[PDB]
Amino acid sequence: STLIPPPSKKQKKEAQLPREVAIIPKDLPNVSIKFQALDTGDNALRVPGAISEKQLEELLNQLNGTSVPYTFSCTIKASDPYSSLIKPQITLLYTPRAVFKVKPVTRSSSAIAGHGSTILCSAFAPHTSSRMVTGAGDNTARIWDCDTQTPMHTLKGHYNWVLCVSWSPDGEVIATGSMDNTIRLWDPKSGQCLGDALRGHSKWITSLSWEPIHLVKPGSKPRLASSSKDGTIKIWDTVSRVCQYTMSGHTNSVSCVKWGGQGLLYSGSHDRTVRVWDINSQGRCINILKSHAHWVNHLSLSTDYALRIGAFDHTGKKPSTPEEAQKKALENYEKICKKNGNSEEMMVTASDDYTMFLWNPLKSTKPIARMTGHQKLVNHVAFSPDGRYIVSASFDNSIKLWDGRDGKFISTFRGHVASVYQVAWSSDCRLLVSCSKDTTLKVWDVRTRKLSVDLPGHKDEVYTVDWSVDGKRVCSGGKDKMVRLWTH
Amino acid sequence: MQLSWKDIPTVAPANDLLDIVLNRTQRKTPTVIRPGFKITRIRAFYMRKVKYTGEGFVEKFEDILKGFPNINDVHPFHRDLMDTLYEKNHYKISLAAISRAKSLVEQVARDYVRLLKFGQSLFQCKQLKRAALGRMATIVKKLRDPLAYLEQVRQHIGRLPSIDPNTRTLLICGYPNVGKSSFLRCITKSDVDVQPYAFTTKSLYVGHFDYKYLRFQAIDTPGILDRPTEEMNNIEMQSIYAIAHLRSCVLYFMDLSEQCGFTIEAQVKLFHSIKPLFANKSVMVVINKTDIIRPEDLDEERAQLLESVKEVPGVEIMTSSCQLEENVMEVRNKACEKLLASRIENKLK
Amino acid sequence: VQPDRRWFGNTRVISQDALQHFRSALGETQKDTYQVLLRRNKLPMSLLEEKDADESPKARILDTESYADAFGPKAQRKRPRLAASNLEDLVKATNEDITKYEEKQVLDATLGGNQEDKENGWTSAAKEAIFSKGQSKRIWNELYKVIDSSDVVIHVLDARDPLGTRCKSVEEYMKKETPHKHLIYVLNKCDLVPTWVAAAWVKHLS
Amino acid sequence: PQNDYIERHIKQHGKRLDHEERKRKREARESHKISERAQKLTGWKGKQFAKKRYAEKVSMRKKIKAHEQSKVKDALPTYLLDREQKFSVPLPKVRGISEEEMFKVIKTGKSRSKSWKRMITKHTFVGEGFTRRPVKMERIIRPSALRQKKANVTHPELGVTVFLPILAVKKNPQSPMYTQLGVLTKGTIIEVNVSELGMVTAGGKVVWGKYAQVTNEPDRDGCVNAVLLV
RNA sequence: AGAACUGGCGAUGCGGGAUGAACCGAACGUAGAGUUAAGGUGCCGGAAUACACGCUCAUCAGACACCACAAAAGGUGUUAGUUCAUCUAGACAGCCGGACGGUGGCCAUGGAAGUCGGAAUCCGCUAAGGAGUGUGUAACAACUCACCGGCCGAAUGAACUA
RNA sequence: CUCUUAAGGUAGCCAAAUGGAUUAACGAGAUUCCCACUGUCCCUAUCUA
RNA sequence: GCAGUCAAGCGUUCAUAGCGACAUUGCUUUUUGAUUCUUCGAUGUCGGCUCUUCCUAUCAUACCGAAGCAGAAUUCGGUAAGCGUUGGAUUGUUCACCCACUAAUAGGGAGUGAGCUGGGUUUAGACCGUCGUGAGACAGGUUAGUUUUACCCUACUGAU
Numbered sequence A: 001s002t003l004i005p006p007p008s009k010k011q012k013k014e015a016q017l018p019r020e021v022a023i024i025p026k027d028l029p030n031v032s033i034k035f036q037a038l039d040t041g042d043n044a045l046r047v048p049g050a051i052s053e054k055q056l057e058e059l060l061n062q063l064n065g066t067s068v069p070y071t072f073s074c075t076i077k078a079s080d081p082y083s084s085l086i087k088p089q090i091t092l093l094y095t096p097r098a099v100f101k102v103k104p105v106t107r108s109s110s111a112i113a114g115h116g117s118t119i120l121c122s123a124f125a126p127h128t129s130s131r132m133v134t135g136a137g138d139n140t141a142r143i144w145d146c147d148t149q150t151p152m153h154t155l156k157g158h159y160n161w162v163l164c165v166s167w168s169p170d171g172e173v174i175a176t177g178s179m180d181n182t183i184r185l186w187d188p189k190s191g192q193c194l195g196d197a198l199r200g201h202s203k204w205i206t207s208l209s210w211e212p213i214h215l216v217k218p219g220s221k222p223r224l225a226s227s228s229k230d231g232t233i234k235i236w237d238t239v240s241r242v243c244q245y246t247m248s249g250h251t252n253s254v255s256c257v258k259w260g261g262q263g264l265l266y267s268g269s270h271d272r273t274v275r276v277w278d279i280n281s282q283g284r285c286i287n288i289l290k291s292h293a294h295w296v297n298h299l300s301l302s303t304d305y306a307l308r309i310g311a312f313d314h315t316g317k318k319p320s321t322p323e324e325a326q327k328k329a330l331e332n333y334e335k336i337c338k339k340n341g342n343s344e345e346m347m348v349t350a351s352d353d354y355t356m357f358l359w360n361p362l363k364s365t366k367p368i369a370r371m372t373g374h375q376k377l378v379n380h381v382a383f384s385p386d387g388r389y390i391v392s393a394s395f396d397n398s399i400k401l402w403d404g405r406d407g408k409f410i411s412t413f414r415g416h417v418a419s420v421y422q423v424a425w426s427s428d429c430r431l432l433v434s435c436s437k438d439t440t441l442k443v444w445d446v447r448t449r450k451l452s453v454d455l456p457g458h459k460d461e462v463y464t465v466d467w468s469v470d471g472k473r474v475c476s477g478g479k480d481k482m483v484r485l486w487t488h
Numbered sequence B: 001m002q003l004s005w006k007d008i009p010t011v012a013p014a015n016d017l018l019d020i021v022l023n024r025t026q027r028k029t030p031t032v033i034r035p036g037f038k039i040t041r042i043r044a045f046y047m048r049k050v051k052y053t054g055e056g057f058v059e060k061f062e063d064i065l066k067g068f069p070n071i072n073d074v075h076p077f078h079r080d081l082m083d084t085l086y087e088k089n090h091y092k093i094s095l096a097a098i099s100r101a102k103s104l105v106e107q108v109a110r111d112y113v114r115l116l117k118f119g120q121s122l123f124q125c126k127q128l129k130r131a132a133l134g135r136m137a138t139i140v141k142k143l144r145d146p147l148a149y150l151e152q153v154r155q156h157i158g159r160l161p162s163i164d165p166n167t168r169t170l171l172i173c174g175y176p177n178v179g180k181s182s183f184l185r186c187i188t189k190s191d192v193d194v195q196p197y198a199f200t201t202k203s204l205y206v207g208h209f210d211y212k213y214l215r216f217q218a219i220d221t222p223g224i225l226d227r228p229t230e231e232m233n234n235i236e237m238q239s240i241y242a243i244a245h246l247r248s249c250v251l252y253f254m255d256l257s258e259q260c261g262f263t264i265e266a267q268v269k270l271f272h273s274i275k276p277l278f279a280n281k282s283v284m285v286v287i288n289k290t291d292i293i294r295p296e297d298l299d300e301e302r303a304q305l306l307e308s309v310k311e312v313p314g315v316e317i318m319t320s321s322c323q324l325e326e327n328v329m330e331v332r333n334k335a336c337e338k339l340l341a342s343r344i345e346n347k348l349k
Numbered sequence C: 001v002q003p004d005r006r007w008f009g010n011t012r013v014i015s016q017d018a019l020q021h022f023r024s025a026l027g028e029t030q031k032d033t034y035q036v037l038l039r040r041n042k043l044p045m046s047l048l049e050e051k052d053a054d055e056s057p058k059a060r061i062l063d064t065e066s067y068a069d070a071f072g073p074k075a076q077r078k079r080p081r082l083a084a085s086n087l088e089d090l091v092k093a094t095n096e097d098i099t100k101y102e103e104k105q106v107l108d109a110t111l112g113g114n115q116e117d118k119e120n121g122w123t124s125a126a127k128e129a130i131f132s133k134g135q136s137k138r139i140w141n142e143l144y145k146v147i148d149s150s151d152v153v154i155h156v157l158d159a160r161d162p163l164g165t166r167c168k169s170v171e172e173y174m175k176k177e178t179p180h181k182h183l184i185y186v187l188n189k190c191d192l193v194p195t196w197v198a199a200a201w202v203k204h205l206s
Numbered sequence D: 001p002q003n004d005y006i007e008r009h010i011k012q013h014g015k016r017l018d019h020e021e022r023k024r025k026r027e028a029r030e031s032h033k034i035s036e037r038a039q040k041l042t043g044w045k046g047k048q049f050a051k052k053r054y055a056e057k058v059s060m061r062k063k064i065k066a067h068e069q070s071k072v073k074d075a076l077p078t079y080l081l082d083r084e085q086k087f088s089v090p091l092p093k094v095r096g097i098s099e100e101e102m103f104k105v106i107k108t109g110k111s112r113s114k115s116w117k118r119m120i121t122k123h124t125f126v127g128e129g130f131t132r133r134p135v136k137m138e139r140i141i142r143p144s145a146l147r148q149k150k151a152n153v154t155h156p157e158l159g160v161t162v163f164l165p166i167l168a169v170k171k172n173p174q175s176p177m178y179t180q181l182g183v184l185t186k187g188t189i190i191e192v193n194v195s196e197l198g199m200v201t202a203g204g205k206v207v208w209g210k211y212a213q214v215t216n217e218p219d220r221d222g223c224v225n226a227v228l229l230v
Numbered sequence E: 001a002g003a004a005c006u007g008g009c010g011a012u013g014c015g016g017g018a019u020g021a022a023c024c025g026a027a028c029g030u031a032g033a034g035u036u037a038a039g040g041u042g043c044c045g046g047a048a049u050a051c052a053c054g055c056u057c058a059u060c061a062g063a064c065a066c067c068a069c070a071a072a073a074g075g076u077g078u079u080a081g082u083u084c085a086u087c088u089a090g091a092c093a094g095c096c097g098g099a100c101g102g103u104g105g106c107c108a109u110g111g112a113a114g115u116c117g118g119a120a121u122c123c124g125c126u127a128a129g130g131a132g133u134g135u136g137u138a139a140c141a142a143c144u145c146a147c148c149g150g151c152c153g154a155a156u157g158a159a160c161u162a
Numbered sequence F: 001c002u003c004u005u006a007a008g009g010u011a012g013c014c015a016a017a018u019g020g021a022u023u024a025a026c027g028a029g030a031u032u033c034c035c036a037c038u039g040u041c042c043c044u045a046u047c048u049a
Numbered sequence G: 001g002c003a004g005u006c007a008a009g010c011g012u013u014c015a016u017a018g019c020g021a022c023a024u025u026g027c028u029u030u031u032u033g034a035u036u037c038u039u040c041g042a043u044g045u046c047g048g049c050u051c052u053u054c055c056u057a058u059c060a061u062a063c064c065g066a067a068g069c070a071g072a073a074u075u076c077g078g079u080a081a082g083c084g085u086u087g088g089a090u091u092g093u094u095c096a097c098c099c100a101c102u103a104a105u106a107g108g109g110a111g112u113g114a115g116c117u118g119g120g121u122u123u124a125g126a127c128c129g130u131c132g133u134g135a136g137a138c139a140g141g142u143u144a145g146u147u148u149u150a151c152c153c154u155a156c157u158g159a160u
């Protein structure tokens, strides 16, 4: 163990003196304050004496006439939130929280054995943190009861590996993509084969994205969308079990697919091309985005966290009817969506040209900004839930934080030794988990831009992670077979 | 150097290039030593083989790097054209690989020779020698894909025509199947094929002629389609960059006929899309294949669409053929006399 | 070699806090020319370095298109990448690249002679071997000896023209290879310039 | 000249009247001319020819095999597929080296008549921090061409080598002298800086000191290879 | 390489191995006769240009150090074997005839019709005919083979060992 | 226990004319160059004892 | 070279006790001809005038073969040793380099330690450095310094 080297003979006598105290002298100088939103509006001049940052909420809330608490910043050189005034008039930058605290995930629960192979994917349920599905390189998927740390229906069906899995946002159906040619829809409770398996794609399945709730009619089930290595995409209906329209624009394999906000599929593909795809035209392309010098791995949206959960907020308290579920799905969307009172969904891509381009496909088929930084290839990209920071995982052992609105560089997370495969957020938009080619997963404090806590556990490579929506629990999976669950 | 690059050595694939350079050392250097020579003699023997085999490669590559035309800092016409044929990134990489592989061979030579001066017997020295030449062979075996690429660009780039950008020229442009090769055949001496289908010519052909005791040069150029214009082919793009970069006149060629599987509105739509190429240029339009069908015979609403082409600031619309060759001789005279006024007006500045 | 539980085991190891401590100190430190380095501390440096560039390397075209497909008889490459936007932008993107060429000929005229001697049909003379001296392997061998032998190299400088009489090269070598060797200038021939000038040079080199 | 001239010439004027009859016969004779070349071509030209003919057989086996194979008819994530790449030490008991080899004698004087200096001819890791000592006080000379800093380590797992810097020499067979001079040899066990591999102990600390055993004799070619003791 | 034993030489001539410390034979007084050892018998050179069965042609064979080295293999050089196949329901080699229909299969594209390419590689009618082995056209065309068939008539092919 | 970067414009203040060993002269002492001159050489030939 | 990977085969018989050809993947430092000014301890003598001959592993001349070989020039290969292969600068050293002519300035062997020399054998003189209490010796460095045949036999060249 190489050490942090010791304090010198003078540096002891520095410490042995009494010093400082917090004090706050009184403090009442009349320094002028401006108020500004990070969205757009400036709101004009007060001039009080100095006060604690809890009180400057209560000054704002009566002025705007809300009771919404607010986070504060100042000096934008610097960028850093009396606590300001010790560093030396103040332009105060206010911004809404969504009020919360998800905790730092520290302890493991002990390692859950099961299927005897590497674990390829691992998705939580949206509505509750007890339910969590895993797809292995053994032909079984498995659903875990996570409160009791034990298997809830060991699940069989396929005759090759299961590469990706996804839970439907309404929370009725699980879908399982395969190394053979097939998709199998499952019920959580029974764990039984809903008809025959969905067969249509000729090569293996790359990712599965659900049709989100606020589009779908109240009292109809959400349709699946499935991309595959042959390069087509099919749109599966769950009841009839048959595809409506194959879509075959891409020449090479499709690396991932996402179903967007406004009836619009996005498909990140190996022909260096990102295809914006309208549903109403019945299988038809509208816009074709070209930047990249290499193929495109992964495609993140600003809404994707809201679209994944679909109506079920952090409590998980259920919708009483589909007409309620419509409104709850619309309201969680319209928390993030109306930023300036306009539905501006941001799209972002990763590719092996060491670069992420930032896109707004409805407004312009040009790109906005070119996030360029990494040495080796970026692999995963993620927006934060509130659409405010972007962060991307890379093969040069380092995770780079980029501002979401203008694609501007913020900082880098350093700590990981070997290559980083994927990341995920805490719902409150503070903590940020990441998984590596080495053993360890780490969790990253986004506000101070720092390592909160390292957690070792596994014996080998770790491919998959996910954070539970409530934010008690974090899953993991990889090459040593054992599913570890992590908590406070 | 400028204007066509015929003299570049020739350049073997890595199997053969290794077979040359290794065997040249065996032949040219002395091949006998005996173990009970003095250690100085044994060390000298092996030092000389590592050195000589080194400079066998560092010769052979240096002729490639010196030979090949240096794609940026040529002249923007050529700089482009070699992109549109050979791909400029693959070109620049493939040579830069050879530039790197030059340096590693020197390094391997200089490092082993410095070991080989401490070699204490015949066996140690002999092993150090084989250890040097194996590394060189490994470096060159890792050069199989570039050398195969370069060998084929060498063969092609020799066979390009020299054109001066700076001389008086004239481009000869339009759709496929119009006539504009059989103009070039009859105006000058040149062997270009005259065959009734679309893309017979696939590169820029050239021919020269003297009018007013002065060398011109015609350029026949494969042909353009209208398109969405972001994507056109490497065959089509040659012509666009020829019209863009080069100075000179340009003869547009229309076939006003039912011949060509190509509607005559779309010829005008080509002209108006291509228009911003011509701003520097001076232009003429030529209606080829008169003799069957005529410009005078035509429908009125059709014949308006020539008078749309008239509206562009500086043009004229000549009749022509290739059945009577007095008329084709008038076209070059108008083409040249419009040029020389622009050259003299450029000169007298 | 006697079998042992020692080996296979991990010898050295580092704390994840201590990386976070040492990564900051690259930002802090600060050199001081009156200070000088005796020992270094054994540290895993590749972890501590990699600082933030803002540019990235170029993309790897060889993976996407080989060579055989890029040009040949095999040759699967009908259209260019990325290619131009529009024929206004193309003709804009020619005319500056013409005049940028036409500049460099008028520049490299005034840089020059070299071609006009070849047109006149004569060559420049042989460079004399004395202007080498020295240079030479026999003396540069003698140099890299005394650097390797010495524990403080000092480096004497002609106080007429010390910038010309410096040499880089060795100092760039010394920092890379042998940081424990200390290094120090001596201006001398301080007779042969005026008194303010020597006082200046020590200021500009200190 | 200009473009595909010979191709255009062949397309018009046409080859040569007895071209077909020439080429067809050359292929008929080639059977005989292989079997002549094999039974002539002395002395290296004969060796190369046979070495080639073996390959040109061994290919034609694999084509005919692959035709016969084609006539009849681990698991990773999405982002990792569509890609590619006791306590016994692995060399116990290496050959013993005499002290008279390795140590070449260096004689000093006008009359070369004093001996006493010794030069280590085998390869050496020296330190981080070295400096030579005065020429009168020196004796055991380790010269600078034989001073390796970085070794070429490989892993039994994984199947990837890396070029890693040496940190120490800990155990040297054939005496505790050659450890202390730092003589690399075959068999020697050396501290390697491992940080490019990215090993992490359970405990979560991350590792940059692994012992590795050298696998070759770096006298006989300049590279120091080694295998990690894992 | 260091240990253990037994031979040979050193003090030892003689026969043979063209010549020779250690290889094959061999009990040294002086002579005569006979018979042999190892080795030999075209001539040098004493003794069969004996007899018998096979194998070998080397544009610098071999006559041997042998129970090795260059050595493992390259050859349309020759002979003898071994194990599978094919065959008067006509093999092997030749010519002659067929080699077709869904179809110019899908994307790809300036043009690709079996043959610049990428994914599949199926059904039908068959005596047999690949979504095609190659040459060839800007594309088609035409020729070719792989596979059937007629003519001819009895043995032939492949892979190994010596 | 605490601590060391000021000298500024083509020659400066200064100290008992000079700031010096970058020492004149001398040398069968060691070494480099230039002029003159030449059979040293290209390339050797001839003559006398 | 080390560590593997495929597998025509060996292993008395033999798939999966161990070996294992031909292929083949790993880095020894950046994919855009940027520089890359890296010169990093030969503890042993060779180097050159004169003159001859030999090898071929051919640099040039002769005749062939193959290449996008149109000419022109060149590269790669075959037979080939008949016949050629130079002039100078540089010792703060030259195990090399450069520039100039040239059809071309190929590589070697026997060299020419009694034909003649220059460095080094190499002793006595002297100085400077390092080491030694010193006599002295050496990590060095610098300067000064006598070996002089044929008339014998053979060979070679001419002569009776």
Ligand SMILES: Nc1nc2c(ncn2[C@@H]2O[C@H](COP(=O)(O)OP(=O)(O)OP(=O)(O)O)[C@@H](O)[C@H]2O)c(=O)[nH]1
Pocket: B175, B176, B177, B178, B179, B180, B181, B182, B183, B193, B194, B195, B196, B197, B198, B199, B200, B201, B220, B221, B222, B223, B288, B289, B290, B291, B292, B320, B321, B322, B323
């Ligand atoms: N009737 C007639 N036909 C003409 C005339 N000039 C050319 N053609 C026809 O043009 C056909 C060939 O076109 P080309 O002359 O090669 O023109 P092009 O194809 O546009 O030129 P390239 O593409 O460069 O070869 C021939 O079939 C000719 O009959 C003419 O004056 N009269």
Ligand SMILES: [Mg+2]
Pocket: B176, B177, B181, B193, B194, B195, B196, B197, B198, B199, B200, B201
């Ligand atoms: Mg044509």
